[PDB]
Amino acid sequence: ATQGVFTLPANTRFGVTAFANSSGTQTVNVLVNNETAATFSGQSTNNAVIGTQVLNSGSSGKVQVQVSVNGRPSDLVSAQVILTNELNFALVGSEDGTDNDYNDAVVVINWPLG
Template identity: 50%
Template sequence: MFINLLNKSQERTVNAHNEANQTDAFKHVLRTAPVGQAQDITGWWRVDQSVTDKGDTDNNDDGTYNLPPNIRFAVTAIANSAAEQTIQIYVDDKMVAQWRDWSTESKNTQTQVLPSGRGKVQVKVLANGKPSLIDGRHVGMAGKTNFFLVATEDGTDNDYNDCLVVINWPLG
């Protein structure tokens, strides 16, 4: 197997390949440098598959994430704004939880445990009744624990910390 990633804008490459008779599945030869100028180095790496294609870097996410179907997941929010934050959680396009909070002291809301249904979960946050901008990322840890970290911006200072929502699974 041979994998090559090319950043055309900076003319740099990262590539990896397994040796033909290699017995260790995670040992690869890695290269990163200007195209054609790198020496091979030995390193360790792991590739994890994200459960969603969301989490781009344009801070204009719609708050929809794909979780595994038919599991329980937890949702906790941190209100960090003088504006009232309304957090809404949708599963398979149906609102299943809603709560309001505000704080300038990073106050946590009560964690709610919800079923994932078919797996489509959406976070919506309103600040004083107006939709907030949302940016979310999937973070997998140790290949087992998963988080969606959601940051929102209510439009006053562009700091994306007005309401922070944490979705985590598996539970138990």
């Protein structure tokens, strides 16, 4: 199934934050309505916050996360969870190798903000 694609409320600000846990340098690209809106990168095996940014989901609300290492796309896992019918998290894990810890880049999208 497709992973890393979320329909957010239209025209709404959201946070997107990436954490690294791998010997490989991660590159995280965040697309809004199919165009790159943020790129984060770094290399840590201790959960460094390699990027965090506030973006607007735009008129369609479509947000997609893709992760690569060495130009090679990582395998993604994702889900969205909503607490008390209002607080939202869109969650992504990714695997760049063979150990299947899926934490090599971790991306959290949260809304609403403010």
